[PDB]
Enzyme design. Structure first.
Site, PDB file in Angstrom:
ATOM      1  N   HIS A  40      -2.005   1.865  -1.084  1.00  0.00           N
ATOM      2  CA  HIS A  40      -2.372   2.566   0.147  1.00  0.00           C
ATOM      3  C   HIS A  40      -1.957   4.034   0.139  1.00  0.00           C
ATOM      4  CE1 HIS A  40       1.748   1.612   2.058  1.00  0.00           C
ATOM      5  NE2 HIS A  40       1.521   2.786   2.603  1.00  0.00           N
ATOM      6  N   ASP A  84      -0.845  -4.360  -3.226  1.00  0.00           N
ATOM      7  CA  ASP A  84      -0.576  -2.981  -2.852  1.00  0.00           C
ATOM      8  C   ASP A  84       0.339  -2.225  -3.821  1.00  0.00           C
ATOM      9  OD1 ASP A  84      -0.633  -0.576  -1.354  1.00  0.00           O
ATOM     10  OD2 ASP A  84       0.687  -1.402   0.188  1.00  0.00           O
ATOM     11  N   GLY A 175       6.194   6.886   5.990  1.00  0.00           N
ATOM     12  CA  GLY A 175       6.635   7.925   5.100  1.00  0.00           C
ATOM     13  C   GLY A 175       7.500   7.401   3.956  1.00  0.00           C
ATOM     14  N   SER A 177       6.589   4.664   2.492  1.00  0.00           N
ATOM     15  CA  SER A 177       5.520   3.988   1.776  1.00  0.00           C
ATOM     16  C   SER A 177       5.463   4.349   0.287  1.00  0.00           C
ATOM     17  CB  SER A 177       4.161   4.359   2.335  1.00  0.00           C
ATOM     18  OG  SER A 177       3.800   3.729   3.551  1.00  0.00           O
ATOM     19  N   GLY A 178       5.368   3.364  -0.590  1.00  0.00           N
ATOM     20  CA  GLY A 178       5.235   3.542  -2.028  1.00  0.00           C
ATOM     21  C   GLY A 178       6.559   3.641  -2.767  1.00  0.00           C
TER      22      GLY A 178
END
Ligand SMILES: N=C(N)c1ccc(CNC(=O)[C@@H]2CCCN2C(=O)CNC2CCCCC2)cc1
Ligand SMILES: [Ca+2]
Length: 223
Positions: A40, A84, A175, A177-178
């Site tokens: 994402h 993801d 924020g 994320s990942g």
């Protein structure tokens, strides 16, 4: 990161920031040429920023390197966030040193109850908005699959796990994320999703990296 603490500069040397004029996602360095993040987080025009602490101040240990390619997992489903995960290649190899270091991929999955480290530059409030400029850290245990599924019925797959605290107060957030979830020296999770941040009975949901090691090793060896 909500309810966490300041990590301290370059204490999480595999943490990267993905930048496209601004920070928008975390990532994890897995060797001198490759970064793992969430699908994402995909966008074109990514610059990878290594050795960061304060993402708004140049402090002297940074390496900024453009991505040459991105590879989203072949089965990524944006609607359900199943699978993801993505790979990002650096146009030139990172210079590895004690502040810019790779994290090891797992050789097997982690157990429920294993303590992990989750880190990132995301929002630190559970109600409202405040973004830190230095890296934040959180110690969080892997939750049972049954508590995870109970929290999020029909939405957890075999490629996801929950981590955190069912009482709330401590969680990853937008924020982050990942970014990494590291347990026993291995990258076991990627910050993926949840409901709000640090809410009761709504723990964070993470991509289950151990399911993708073969894919990761095959993909980087062929690209
Ligand atoms: N640990 C947490 N509380 C937490 C919560 C949210 C986020 C950021 N992630 C996100 O916001 C992600 C990406 C865009 C849609 N998204 C979502 O969380 C959207 N809802 C999901 C429900 C389950 C099916 C997939 C969609 C990162 C961490
Ligand atoms: Ca900096």
């Amino acid at each position: 990161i909500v309810g966490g603490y300041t990590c301290g500069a370059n204490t999480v040397p595999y943490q990267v920031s993905l930048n496209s004029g601004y920070h928008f996602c975390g990532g994890s360095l897995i060797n001198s040429q490759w970064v793992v993040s969430a699908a994402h987080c995909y966008k074109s025009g990514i610059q990878v920023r290594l050795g960061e602490d304060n993402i708004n101040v140049v402090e002297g240990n940074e390496q900024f390197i453009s991505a040459s390619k991105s590879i989203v997992h072949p089965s990524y489903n944006s609607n359900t966030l199943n699978n993801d995960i993505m790979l990002i290649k650096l146009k030139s190899a990172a210079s590895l040193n004690s502040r810019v270091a790779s994290i090891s991929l797992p050789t097997s999955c982690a157990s429920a109850g294993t303590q992990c480290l989750i880190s990132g530059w995301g929002n630190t409030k559970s109600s409202g908005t405040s973004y830190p400029d230095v890296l934040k850290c959180l110690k969080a245990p892997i939750l049972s699959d049954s508590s995870c599924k109970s929290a999020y019925p029909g939405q957890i797959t075999s490629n996801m796990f929950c981590a955190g605290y069912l009482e709330g107060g401590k969680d990853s957030c937008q924020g982050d994320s990942g970014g990494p979830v590291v347990c026993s020296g291995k990258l076991q999770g990627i910050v993926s999703w949840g409901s709000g941040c640090a809410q009761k009975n709504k723990p964070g949901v993470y991509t289950k990296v151990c399911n993708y090691v073969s894919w990761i090793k095959q993909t980087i060896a062929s690209n």
